[PDB]
Design a protein around this ligand. Sequence first.
Ligand SMILES: [Zn+2]
Ligand SMILES: [Zn+2]
Lengths: 598, 358
Amino acid sequence: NVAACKENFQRFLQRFIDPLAKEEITEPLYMQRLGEINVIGEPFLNVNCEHIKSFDKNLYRQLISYPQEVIPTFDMAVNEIFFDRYPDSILEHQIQVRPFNALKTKNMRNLNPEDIDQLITISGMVIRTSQLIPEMQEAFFQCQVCAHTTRVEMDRGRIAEPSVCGRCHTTHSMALIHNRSLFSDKQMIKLQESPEDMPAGQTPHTVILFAHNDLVDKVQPGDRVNVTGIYRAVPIRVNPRVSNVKSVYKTHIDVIHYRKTDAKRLHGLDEEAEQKLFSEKRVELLKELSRKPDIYERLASALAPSIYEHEDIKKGILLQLFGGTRKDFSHTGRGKFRAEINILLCGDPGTSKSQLLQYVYNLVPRGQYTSGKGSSAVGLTAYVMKDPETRQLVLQTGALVLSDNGICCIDEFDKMNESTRSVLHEVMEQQTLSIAKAGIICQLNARTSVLAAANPIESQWNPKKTTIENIQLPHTLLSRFDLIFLLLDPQDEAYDRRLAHHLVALYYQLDMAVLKDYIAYAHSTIMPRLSEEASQALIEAYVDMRKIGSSRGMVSAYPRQLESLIRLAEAHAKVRLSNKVEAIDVEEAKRLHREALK
Amino acid sequence: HLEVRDEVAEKCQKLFLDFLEEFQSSDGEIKYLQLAEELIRPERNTLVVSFVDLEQFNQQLSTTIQEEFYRVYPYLCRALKTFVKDRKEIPLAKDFYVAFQDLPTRHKIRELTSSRIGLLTRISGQVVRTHPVHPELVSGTFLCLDCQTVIRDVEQQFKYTQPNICRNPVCANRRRFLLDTNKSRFVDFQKVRIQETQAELPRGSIPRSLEVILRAEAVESAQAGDKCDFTGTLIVVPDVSKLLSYRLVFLACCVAPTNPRFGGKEQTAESIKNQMTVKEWEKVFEMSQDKNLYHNLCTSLFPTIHGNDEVKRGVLLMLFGGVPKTTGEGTSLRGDINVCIVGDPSTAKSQFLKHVEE
Ligand SMILES: [Zn+2]
Ligand SMILES: [Zn+2]
């Protein structure tokens, strides 16, 4: 069973060819993988245990049925085909093998006891993790008489005491020395089945996974993964004293491989090292698309290809996905400087606000969606809970802190009593949060960016009143926003006709990976610095704003707006990869700031 | 039959005992023979050896400490009980402790894997709680019960451990010994909890925490709210209720603030005018003699605020403080002044406060 399988696996690893494409025939597929493993670190080999289903079918029966008596063979049979690069580079740990599956195999509700201890794949949404837990591997005993130190191994899954000192023979003198033994790591994680793929009218389950030595911190709460690993069940004891174990076992999953393919979202900020992992064939594409005279309007108009025109709101929500530069003000003692853009959408009903939030929330990774009455003051920022076991008050994070890199869509912004609305004043302007409660005195921080939607008071935009009276928000809160979009839309007989003609079409029947990669690039390798010709159009653009907004009674302008222009101007330069702010990048993001309140 | 020479430990003990005497400072005058002087008056029992100097004097040693720091700690402390017998006034059963400092390389509370147990690391964090101080039994002296002898020098490991063998061929109770408690050896023991510092938090994460165990004359250095910088070894600890389950614990030996505002060592005009380095004191004098000082602290404290010249002055006079007096009856006059600002939107109110607090 052991020798008969490495011989059959090496063949696979050597002679395999696929009708597929990788990294955008080079026959030695897994030998090329094994070469890459040698040119860099990271001694793991991600094998797809379906390729081994084409090449063979009598190991693919024994890999998903005796996985713990096979995967060691799959390590050994890779160490030897590493002969090509043995002398060249000599790493230390070992080479590894990690079967997986592109597509899931089961749910969390159809795990049956004919599947105990055999490879299994599920999918879910990690809820919470834990801190590391040691786990002994090699004991280390020592006698009190002979003071002789033997080192017994854990082979089957338990540690046996020798009870005879190889020198003095006192028949029990061998204590166990803890901190001289060898330990390994172990983490406990909880999945939660996705809303899709669950029965009619039911509540999500959870499943406990156990990570191990190297996978120990490779996932975060809030991630959607495709875990692959063995499925085990261990007994439990009714007393922690007697050996009377129960008869109903308890199951978990010894994870073996993760996979976070989130193509429905963009790129999270764990892949900044992975931006250097772009095909140079692609950087040409991006740099060339960034030269067309209107790449702004060509990318913007590709957001949410179901909303009708609304041309400006998509401009704003596109500049929000880039944000101003991240300058480093630690020297001037000023503190830090917000670089993300907060957008407010106000306008009479039916104008498709909540659809834009529902679209963004499903686009950006690390986001949240909240509402008006179903969210409290402390549930948005940070609460203090009586931890159940230890009976102690411990801190937790709300919604505005769980996002932290992304967008916190807050629908129904009007219908939040003024208490829970005055909480956003801190987290949305300084990017911080200062907590001082019973035993907890700390100061969090986050890099969120609100995107709120409200209705006018009376829910009807009556043009008799003044703009600062249909909104009915204070000034110490309207100034923390910098793009207040008034969707003033009546019954334009032409607009209604065009919209209906568009909506009906959805009943008969640019790319993403351009945008999904353009964004990662424009985040990784761009930092627009102002100029002197741009800086000289930014001063007057604020001295006129005052005289304008003073009289009309619409919305006054405080010096904070002069920073927003910066935030907007720079954010425009990033769209075209210009790496330097010039004049036009101020006129554009000034016309945008002016022609939104009209 | 006789015990085994733990050679890697005793050779290190010997070389450390040599280093303690040979190493000298810039002017001869062996330095660990004068810091070890105050080590005799009561309540002092920790010598603080810098680690960078142990790098100068030797390097085949530093790589033994920094890799076996738990094997060879019980010997680097005996090699301090012999080096200090040259004083003759120490109680003969007193015991001393070595406390390193100034390690080269730092770490983070999230880099404390399980591949680090038993080594010598260095950690920075905040401080959340501080439990009270206790005694802890390091080596009990079991007064035998039937023999009326004294079984002696028995080491405990996280439990009471009840050694059960007597050197008397007639010991009717290999399961009964009443230990004394007026000869045994105790050491202080405080257990505090530290929380990951702010500048290390990965974005979108709740800060972790671990237990550190101060175990010496170092027992109340860290208080709650401080940002100390601990340097000890990571150890594993069982669950003594069933003596398994293990949990990680930091076993600190030295603790010092993370960034000393005055790098000398850490309360009237003279005590402070002593620590003033030559340039420090020739600059403070220059300022105190400066004219128009009251206009170069405003212009130098709030450099990015045009105007409100009557607010910066008040803020300064708030920072300097008045004279706090205590009336003879028992009351007390308030010494420091309070200041409130009230104004239109966006007039640089929160900017004065952020300036002052940073
Ligand atoms: Zn023995
Ligand atoms: Zn006895």
